[PDB]
Amino acid sequence: PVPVSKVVSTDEYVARTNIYYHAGTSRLLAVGHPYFPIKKPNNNKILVPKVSGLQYRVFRIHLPDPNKFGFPDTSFYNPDTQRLVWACVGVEVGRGQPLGVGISGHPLLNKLDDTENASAYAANAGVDNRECISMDYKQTQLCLIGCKPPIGEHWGKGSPCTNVAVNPGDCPPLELINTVIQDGDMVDTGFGAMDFTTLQANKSEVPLDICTSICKYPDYIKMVSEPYGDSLFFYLRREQMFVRHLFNRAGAVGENVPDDLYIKGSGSTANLASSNYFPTPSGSMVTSDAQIFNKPYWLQRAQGHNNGICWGNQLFVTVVDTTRSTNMSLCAAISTSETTYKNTNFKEYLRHGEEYDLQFIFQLCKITLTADVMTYIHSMNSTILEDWNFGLQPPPGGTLEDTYRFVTSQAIACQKHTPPAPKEDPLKKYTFWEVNLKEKFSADLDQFPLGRKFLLQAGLKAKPKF
Amino acid sequence: YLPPVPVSKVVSTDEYVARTNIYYHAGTSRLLAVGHPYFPIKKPNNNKILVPKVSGLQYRVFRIHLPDPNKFGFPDTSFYNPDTQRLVWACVGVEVGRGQPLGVGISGHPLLNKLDDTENASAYAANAGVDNRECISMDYKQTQLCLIGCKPPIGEHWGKGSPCTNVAVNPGDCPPLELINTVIQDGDMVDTGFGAMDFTTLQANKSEVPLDICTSICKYPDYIKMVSEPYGDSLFFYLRREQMFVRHLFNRAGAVGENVPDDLYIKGSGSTANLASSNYFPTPSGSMVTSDAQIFNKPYWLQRAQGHNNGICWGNQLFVTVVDTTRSTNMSLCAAISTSETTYKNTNFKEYLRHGEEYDLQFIFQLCKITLTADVMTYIHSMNSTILEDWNFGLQPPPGGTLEDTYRFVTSQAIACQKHTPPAPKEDPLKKYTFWEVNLKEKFSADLDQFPLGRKFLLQAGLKAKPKFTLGKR
Amino acid sequence: YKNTNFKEYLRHGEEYDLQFIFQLCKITLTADVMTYIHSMNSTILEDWNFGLQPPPGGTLEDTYRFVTSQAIACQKHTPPAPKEDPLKKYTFWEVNLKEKFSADLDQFPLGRKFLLQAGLKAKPKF
Amino acid sequence: IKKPNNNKILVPKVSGLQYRVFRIHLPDPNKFGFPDTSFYNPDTQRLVWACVGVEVGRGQPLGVGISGHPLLNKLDDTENASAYAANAGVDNRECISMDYK
Amino acid sequence: DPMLTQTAASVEVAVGGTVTIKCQASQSIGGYLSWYQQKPGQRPKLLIYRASTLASGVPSRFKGSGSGTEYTLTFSGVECADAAAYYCQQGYTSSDINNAFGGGTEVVVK
């Protein structure tokens, strides 16, 4: 009758009990190629996967729902008109590989000449002026915790306008596109957050690890201004980048410079070089002082209205690390019997390692369910009551009559067995890294490395044994 | 959770809108219209309108956009909770005005289908010239009206529809002539003379009446449809007025299809074995148009509607239509191609025709708040869906996002095509039907002492302590 | 690969966001304050009127006059606009905020940071 | 970017170096409904807005731009010169790029 | 193989006439196209390149247009020294082609 049209923080309709719980995965590893996936020459099947330092890393946390808990104490809640939900208080992202950097490049980059100190004027191009240049990337570290997946943005091509006619060779159009981050998306490398598949026609602009894929920067001002605050509870950032080399573009300039910009040259300088330039990024020194990880994060109040409540019994952790991206470089001989060194005796490979840890603390929270509160949860996300057993609507049914006993042979109503297949959930079109935290819970905090760091945050040592 | 039963009958507005002492005045400035009185002139090559058709026989429906009083400023002691009650405007006084001399407005087109007169004769001649039609001009009939409603008014005409597939013998047959009623635009004409038939989709010779109503429809308002609807909407103060007279008696071409019966006359001989005509069109003439009975510049007010709702204006909107043909002057204009010739000529001066009209509107609006506790909420949504949909009572969708990116340079080659290319409604449904917009978003005034209607309303009701005793006598 | 096959271009994106918090203030206009503000800037006392006992004056005609057909008579935009902007020779970015105001400081992402600093909380619904 | 026939610009010039000056249009407070006080008197009072807090936000990823000229006055280097310089004829301008502060 | 045919022998023109020489191409070449005048006693000599930009020391009474696959070359006010040979020529610099960019003539002007 009095439905409200405001947004209420969850400190008003969720109670906080005393019962804490600890969880934690084992450790996460991944091994493969840093540049491109390697598949067989005939089918689509990948022999090794592509794991690099630059790609994103989104973990989803499958939780078991606490209403299925059999508590020996049956007095602190009543399963008549209450539901139970988890709330995260402690987050830890642990990593263990040693520090360092990693470089990438292209066998055929498309630079004309250096421009920082030109001795004389440049010669003409010719055809096929490609080169092999490699460089290091910008330095980036982030971490976001959320109930729903991260929401990033990237520039791309839209449709041009239908009034004027286009020709082959025009400038592509541009617009902002908001997408959903998966695992395998590349980070921005200092070449801006733009798609390179539909906007780099020559396929030889950037190094090849981001040559045929979208790089996405996370949209901050979209996610904070979203209602209900379910997109992020908090975040963290440290980025640095400076420019090292300054090259010249090679390729036809689209629009010439207007003649009022420069006094017209002559002689050997009758014409112009390519006007546009592109820089070469460089990350500075890494250190163990400017790190983010291997230290816990106790949250007191999240920025949004959701003060750390896990609807649907899941949460999403993302992280991007480039301070641990050294690619090991192995090689294997075909025959060690030789006396001399011949460079055709060895093959070369590249491999990249990656290592993780995740450790949490969840608090047990209950919800009193009044019909005024029942329409509010019905309004923000309708699938919550369907994932509980509370959404009630009865169909009576007509008690339909069964068919003939013979059924398989000579039945008149033949093929009445017909399968429906509606068994579907959302979020399953996207693929990314999952973990299984269903069987890793515990109530004893003192048997775990994070659990002793939690009690020192708030006292309450509880261990009398003598 | 189980809402109570809604009452099966409709109800007046006295039970569920409130009335305060806060009044406002809103008067538009001045409205002028110049063009040609007969046809909108256009280029010989294609369609482009240099002058509009402007003649004093149109409908001139107005559309008053009101300011939304859910964010509007007031003096003290006016308070409400926006989660419980909302606000709406109600009109209590209205005026329609014109400053002009007092005219006639005759017309007639040079190809009018007339054969002879049937008032006197000496010998009738069966003539039947191929197109023997001749220019005859005529007068019209004076009419006035004023209708004030929340939604536009409704007129009617007599047209043509599909008959039953029983008999089809000839293309020279007769239509069924069923009656239909439409919504009234700005530019449809009225004649209470020849009457409400569209002369285009009914008459193919298009030479029956003068040319000011020959390419369009001559409508006429209903007064039954707009009172029989169960709400009391679309009109709540009407003032009808007209006069008429018959002048002359004529004949059409005479290609009669509905023949005369045999057993009506007696057959003679010689020249007396034929038929003269059976179809007679008379001409109208408005007479003695004296300016003491003119229903204008008189500030009438409202205490009672003829319908169920009073002047409550849902949707912050209002419609005014006035019809006048007493200011129907015509301006014989002419200009000369060369002035040096000291003798006047045939073709040295060529002439034109124009027509003009001047309006002025003034209103008095009254504030009205409406409380809503679970009972009128069921009633208002069932009255019209858009009344409840113009106020948000539902909380936010799960993605709200930053409403529209709003690119800066809207015409370039950098961005893609933008700005309302797929138009999802939210607009008025009546966009396909044109009106006269009158923007009154910030015309309002809290005080009304220094306003030309404002003292006329103030004098009528009580003015005791309302004016105030600014600087005194002694 | 042909070096004459591809035209090259440059673009540059830009992003902004403005958020504000205002509070209104009231000025008692006695005889002494109106001497102060008129010495500061005289056209502030023409936003609000205060200076002219008829806002017309004796010499004013009809306040407005609108010849609406759009194209046949004396022209509508050819009269020069009197209410000139005293900075209109300078062109810069145009931002309108005449309807984005609101009163609930709990909803907007700055607004609860304002209720962090000064403290307090809204009245609870449940 | 302009077509050489006309003066209407095709693509506007936007760079990350120039100023940005925003005009904020506050709506006038003498037409707004304020909830519950008999505070305002139209004779001896007027209303005006004050500013308390500002947050300006940017949302593009970090990155350093770059610019130059195809033709710039540059005779030689001076950081380290071995032999003496050569004479300068006509059209001794090269292509040098840089980055700003 | 991008091929420009130019199977068009020129028509007799008087002083001040206008001539429309049309050079069509099979494959799309962009705007990269050249034109030349060949007086039959000396070296060839170029007028316009990229179908719009004329060279130095050439009057602006020669015109250039055409885009995509077909192109043209018009002018007016024919002098006495315009008796020469004309040739359209593309610049797609491919490998497996045998262009020779041939075709084109011009009569002696009356």
Curated annotation (Swiss-Prot), chain A:
Q: What is an example of a GO molecular function annotated in this UniProt entry?
A: structural molecule activity
Q: Which residues cross the membrane?
A: none
Note the superkingdom of the native organism.
Viruses
Q: Which residues form a coiled coil?
A: none
Where does the UniProt annotation locate this protein?
Answer: Virion; Host nucleus
The record's section on InterPro entries has: Capsid_L1_Papillomavir, Capsid_L1_sf_Papillomavir, dsDNA_vir_gr_I_capsid
Keywords, comma-separated and alphabetical: Capsid protein, Disulfide bond, Host nucleus, Host-virus interaction, Late protein, T=7 icosahedral capsid protein, Ubl conjugation, Viral attachment to host cell, Viral penetration into host cytoplasm, Virion, Virus endocytosis by host, Virus entry into host cell
Any one GO CC term of this protein is: host cell nucleus
One Pfam assignment:
Late_protein_L1
Coarse class of the primary localization is: virion
Q: Which GO terms describe its biological process?
A: endocytosis involved in viral entry into host cell; virion attachment to host cell
Q: How is it modified after translation?
A: ISGylated by host HERC5, this results in dominant-negative effect on virus infectivity.
Q: Which family does it belong to?
A: Belongs to the papillomaviridae L1 protein family.
Its annotated function is as follows: Forms an icosahedral capsid with a T=7 symmetry and a 50 nm diameter. The capsid is composed of 72 pentamers linked to each other by disulfide bonds and associated with L2 proteins. Binds to heparan sulfate proteoglycans on cell surface of basal layer keratinocytes to provide initial virion attachment. This binding mediates a conformational change in the virus capsid that facilitates efficient infection. The virion enters the host cell via endocytosis. During virus trafficking, L1 protein dissociates from the viral DNA and the genomic DNA is released to the host nucleus.
> What other remark does the UniProt record contain for this protein?
HPV16, in comparison to HPV types 6 and 11, is more often associated with malignant genital cancers in humans.
Name listed for the protein in its UniProt record: Major capsid protein L1
Taxonomic lineage of this organism?
Viruses, Monodnaviria, Shotokuvirae, Cossaviricota, Papovaviricetes
UniProtKB/Swiss-Prot annotation, chain B:
- Please give an example of a GO cellular component term from this record: T=7 icosahedral viral capsid
Q: Which domain of life is it from?
A: Viruses
Tell me the GO BP annotations in alphabetical order. endocytosis involved in viral entry into host cell; virion attachment to host cell
Please indicate if the UniProt record lists Disulfide bond as a keyword.
yes
How far does the signal peptide extend, from start to end residue? none
Tell me which UniProt keywords the record has, alphabetically.
Capsid protein, Disulfide bond, Host nucleus, Host-virus interaction, Late protein, T=7 icosahedral capsid protein, Ubl conjugation, Viral attachment to host cell, Viral penetration into host cytoplasm, Virion, Virus endocytosis by host, Virus entry into host cell
Subcellular location field: Virion; Host nucleus
An MF annotation (GO) of this entry = structural molecule activity
The keyword Ligase is annotated on this UniProt entry: no
Q: What is its main location?
A: virion
* Modifications made to the protein after synthesis: ISGylated by host HERC5, this results in dominant-negative effect on virus infectivity.
Name the Pfam families on file: Late_protein_L1
| Subunit-structure text | Self-assembles into homopentamers. The capsid has an icosahedral symmetry and consists of 72 capsomers, with each capsomer being a pentamer of L1. Interacts with the minor capsid protein L2; this interaction is necessary for viral genome encapsidation. Interacts with protein E2; this interaction enhances E2-dependent replication and transcription activation. Interacts with host KPNA2; this interaction mediates the nuclear localization of L1 capsomers. Interacts with host ITGA6. Interacts with host SDC1; this interaction promotes efficient infection of keratinocytes.
The record's comment on protein family reads: Belongs to the papillomaviridae L1 protein family.
What else the UniProt entry mentions is: HPV16, in comparison to HPV types 6 and 11, is more often associated with malignant genital cancers in humans.
What protein name applies here? Major capsid protein L1
What organism is the protein native to? Human papillomavirus type 16
UniProtKB/Swiss-Prot annotation, chain D:
Task: Kindly list the places in or outside the cell where this protein is found, as annotated in its UniProt entry.
Answer: Virion; Host nucleus
Supply one GO CC term from the record.
host cell nucleus
Keyword annotations from UniProtKB, A to Z: Capsid protein, Disulfide bond, Host nucleus, Host-virus interaction, Late protein, T=7 icosahedral capsid protein, Ubl conjugation, Viral attachment to host cell, Viral penetration into host cytoplasm, Virion, Virus endocytosis by host, Virus entry into host cell
Q: What's one GO BP annotation on this UniProt entry?
A: virion attachment to host cell
Question: What modifications does the entry list under PTM / processing?
Answer: ISGylated by host HERC5, this results in dominant-negative effect on virus infectivity.
Q: What is its main location?
A: virion
* Molecular function via GO: structural molecule activity
- Assembly with partners or alone: Self-assembles into homopentamers. The capsid has an icosahedral symmetry and consists of 72 capsomers, with each capsomer being a pentamer of L1. Interacts with the minor capsid protein L2; this interaction is necessary for viral genome encapsidation. Interacts with protein E2; this interaction enhances E2-dependent replication and transcription activation. Interacts with host KPNA2; this interaction mediates the nuclear localization of L1 capsomers. Interacts with host ITGA6. Interacts with host SDC1; this interaction promotes efficient infection of keratinocytes.
Q: What else is known?
A: HPV16, in comparison to HPV types 6 and 11, is more often associated with malignant genital cancers in humans.
The family this protein is said to belong to: Belongs to the papillomaviridae L1 protein family.
What is this protein called in UniProt? Major capsid protein L1
Query: Which species is this UniProt entry from?
Result: Human papillomavirus type 16
